[PDB]
A paper describes a structure:
To examine the molecular foundations of BSH substrate specificity, we determined the crystal structures of six of the Lactobacillaceae BSHs examined above: four glycine-preferring (LgasBSHb, LaciBSHa, LingBSH, LreuBSH) and two taurine-preferring (LgasBSHa, LjohBSHc) BSHs. We examined the sequences of these loops and found that taurine-preferring enzymes exclusively contained G-V/T-G (‘G-X-G’) motifs, while glycine-preferring enzymes solely contained S-R-G/S (‘S-R-X’) motifs. Furthermore, the taurine-preferring LaviBSH, LjohBSHc and LgasBSHa (corresponding to the clusters arrafinosis, johnsonii_1 and gasseri_1, respectively) enzymes are all present within a single major clade, while the LsalBSH (cluster salivarius_1) stands alone in a distantly related branch. This suggests that taurine preference may have evolved twice within Lactobacillaceae. To examine the recalcitrance of MCBAs more broadly, we monitored the deconjugation kinetics of 5 BSHs that had previously exhibited assorted substrate preferences (LingBSH, LgasBSHa, LgasBSHb, LjohBSHc and LreuBSH).
Bile salt hydrolases (BSHs) comprise a diverse family of microbial enzymes that catalyse critical BA transformation. Primary conjugated BAs synthesized in the liver, such as the tauro- and glycoconjugates of cholic acid (TCA, GCA), are deconjugated by BSHs to generate cholic acid (CA) (BA names and abbreviations are summarized in Supplementary Fig. 1). We found that Lactobacillaceae BSHs display a clear bias for either glycine or taurine-conjugated BAs. Notably, each monomer contains a loop that swaps into the active site of a neighbouring monomer within the tetramer and places amino acids proximal to the catalytic residues.
Residue numbers in the entry:
A (entry chain C), C (entry chain B), D (entry chain A): 2 to 322
B (entry chain D): 2 to 318
């Protein structure tokens, strides 16, 4: 997975992710409206206060999101974090206890600013509890963003719960976020500016085409390598103006770091690849997506009809693997 | 630039390119209909016999294509080939003489199969002659493809005119095609299969996520590096079924190797990037494209109306 | 800097380092004998109880070692750890307080086994105090080894004092040791075994020469990259038999990862390069070394004459930069 | 294999190679004296015009060199060139015909300057014939150097006989020399100067250590990769003064690009590695070498006693594999 966020000069947020998986989930766009039942495994049951859009599955009427965004412009994406994610065996008294899947709606229902999320997370404990006994707990970490800032949330055996500022605007997979941030110092030799003709011991040596300054940028799908490239692209991509250009910029970056079908075969023998790329535009309350086998940009919107539905609105399910 | 071609299991061709440039050409989709006037600098002027679609600019009523495709499913893309491309100073008696820009319509107007093109090229001489005094001659090389095979055409000071089979289905920029083919042998260590946990002197070392077998795959935009990655992705992407899935596969590969705005600044100080990605589907006669600043997939079609137009038709972006 | 240790099948230790620097030190081999004055900033002054050999400089009769090894087979090398090393502003009551430079002789004078060092370090505090006001405090971390095991010692603002088992046998420079260990998982695609001929879409693609399995092994001098390469070479270098073959194996690995003069210019404008490579062989009590401008392998030995000297034995000083 | 040549400011040549192989040869230093029998397959037999030193084997009194250097300062090294090298089926009328193994002594016996070698090579034909029927024909290419210049000689099925100027001072293995020269343009992003602290989307990103400018320099043993690295190191290594410093500079570069034992296993299951590194110093008429299992720098010299011997002079044979 790769998560990405950035804004335009007007404070409009473009935020979303590639989902990179090696099996089917039947994922689809879900709109969760206001006043919808919101049970919790450890907290009091309540109802939704905000409409939410994103991609996920529905289990017994509960929308379990891979990534989702509220009508106020605050979103969250859960990305794979294997060999690292570790949640508590049971709830911890005194904490706000959430089964790990519940963080998606807890963040998007209760807050409009990442600043509020950061403060509340100081007393949150994530529990190794699945939606029901027929599912396994997904090893995930999260990127959360509004138009002002983004944070990363990781819970591990090594470090416990950590919350990091994410000025880079990106996230991938394992290992932990500080490891990846530290890794960027090893790529400071990257330069967008092309090299020029040189003399190596008197032998003329000159570029054959543009791009020579980024020698060493990795193009494989190892999470550390996609992190470096996504951070580098986001750091150097100029500001875009308008909805079309910012959505395009977003898909340009995420499609650059997509995991391409056939290029990764896991130890189980299955293809791992980017099954979808999705972008939420806070300015237009529109969720854009395309899929590995259908490149058409589909759009889904939070509006006065969808936000006030009495039922979940579910769209066509995408199948693969 | 990156050119790409592949077919499905039913013989439908998907063929197109990224255009990676550092200036605006004011390009758009041009449909050249049948019976349109077609001048030649060194041949008898004539008219088009086949309709053609693609991306380019119109210069004094001449459609100058970056890449274009005829109604019979034969196409050609011209990609930058600096420090290498060299064409004749003037026409050479006894040869079919073409100004280099004229190869685009010469190929798409006179042939339906690459086999015919390969034979006719044996007596073609490309000439260093611009469309008019107001334009420079573009240093280009070409990929030409139908549903059966693709060829690469390069004319260089170093090697003269060369025509290669292109089983890999890809082309980028300089150096020459044989140089790139030879480079692939240095990347035989790439493997789509993930690595497994290991012991380094007793220290457990294990992957943190998937993708470990492709360690060393380059992700920068140097032409040699886009060539390796595009070739590797095309070699390992399984067959796709149907128009939607094949167009998506095509765009998945080309967007992976796109040159991203802001990540390349040339020595003249300008950003170089993938301004558009375009795919021609021979089976639907449809040219798909999106642009750096508009990701929506746009479609333009050779149909009985557009193919029989009395005008050039252009669609702007 | 790159530190390296390994043993043969008879328990003989080969341990040493490349010193990679950008300024002159006039360094040379120093034998510190038994019964030599040993002052401490925060402990009772004493005398040496064990003879030590290594490379260093002499400051008012105090031998300050870059790396050193005692007559009982226990050694330590201090390697640069910039942007990370952090020692306490002053001594801490109740701790064994050592100015950071004092760890070299504290370790080699008081112990013969790493197991003892590990236990004693539980109550050690390293202080940011130079040998005198005319010297800066070097930001260092250390590898310590006997014939049974090696440890890494790092003290940082990020993590405080950490002591790691170093099964890999290597150490370089920043960042911290756990970061480098974690980085190795990103290089699991490396394989000593050569690739074979392949078909890419029907195009024959075959190796042009041997070595194809290690595609992606980095050859620059960034510390993370030398760590990966040194760890990989040591992991795959077979056992060697006898003194000459083990010393050669050692120099083969370290010279492979040397920082080559002219290839690195630091931001202060100075060339940084491997000024020397050195190996202590515990089995022969011999320190082997060569230098960037003199490749001859020189030997210096702890014996009954040198170990019982009344004076420091200082061999020729090596000037550079 | 990697070949390297450079000079000091006084016109003294340092020229030699790493021998990287996957089988035993029992190689050793051989001095071929003046007036020694010199048979040719396709030319009249003669005697040696001058003394030569280098590394090789002796076959029925014929010294067959991996690399060799005459007393007048001209040398040649034969390096593996598989999948390319192709010599003629039998001699060709009107040419100076040499079995490919005969070029080593043909060049070093008949010439002092590369300019004269190049002119003579215009009528030379290399023949696919072994020293006797018990040996295969080695698929070699050659680097030839004096103090003024170096050339590469390649005879391939792809290109026929080609002679290239070698300002870079290096040679490795396949593919052909022009391919490698062309490859260097793809590495123009390399810069000895370290990067500086940067801001990636407002996130401070700074080097952890020196060497960041050479991001992307490959460290594996694929021939193209050793060629890039060897060329880059030679291009940037400053001038050295005197015999010791220049010999050290030479060994520093070649040991940096050595093929390390255990890190390359060929498809036949055998280790490929640098069995020796050797350097001829024209100014001292001395051949320096060390070996994978004996790092001592040994010296062998062309002098009044060795150049005038009535018999071939051989030194100890080095076995491996």
């Amino acid at each position: 997975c790769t998560g990405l966020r950035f804004t335009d000069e007007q404070g409009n947020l473009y935020f979303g992710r590639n989902l990179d998986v090696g099996q089917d989930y039947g994922e689809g766009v879900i709109i969760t409206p206001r006043h919808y039942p919101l049970p919790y495994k450890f907290l009091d049951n309540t109802t939704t206060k905000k409409a939410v859009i994103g991609m996920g599955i529905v289990v017994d009427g509960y929308p379990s999101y891979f990534d989702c965004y509220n009508e106020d412009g605050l979103g969250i994406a859960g990305l794979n974090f294997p060999h690292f994610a570790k949640f508590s065996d049971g709830p911890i008294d005194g904490k706000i206890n959430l089964a790990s899947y519940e963080i998606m709606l807890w963040v998007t229902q209760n807050f409009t600013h990442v600043s509020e999320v950061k403060e509340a997370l100081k007393n949150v404990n994530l529990v190794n509890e699945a939606i029901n006994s027929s599912f396994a707990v997904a090893p995930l970490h999260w990127i959360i963003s509004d138009s002002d800032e983004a944070i990363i949330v990781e819970v591990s055996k090594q470090y416990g719960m950590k919350v990091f500022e994410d000025k880079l605007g990106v996230l991938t997979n394992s290992p932990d976020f500080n490891w990846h941030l530290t890794n960027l110092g090893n790529y400071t030799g990257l330069n967008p500016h092309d090299a020029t003709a040189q003399s190596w011991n008197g032998q003329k040596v000159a570029p054959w085409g543009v791009g020579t300054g980024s020698l060493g940028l990795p193009g494989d799908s190892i999470p550390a390598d996609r992190f470096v490239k996504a951070a580098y692209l986001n750091a150097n991509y100029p500001a875009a103006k308008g909805e079309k250009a910012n959505v395009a910029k977003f898909f340009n970056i995420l499609k650059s770091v997509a995991m391409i079908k056939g290029s990764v075969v896991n130890v189980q023998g299955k293809d791992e690849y980017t099954v979808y790329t999705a972008c939420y535009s806070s300015g237009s309350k529109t969720y854009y997506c395309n899929f590995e086998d259908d490149f058409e940009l589909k759009t889904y919107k939070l509006d006065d009809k969808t936000m006030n539905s009495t039922s979940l609105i579910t769209y066509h399910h995408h199948h693969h693997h």
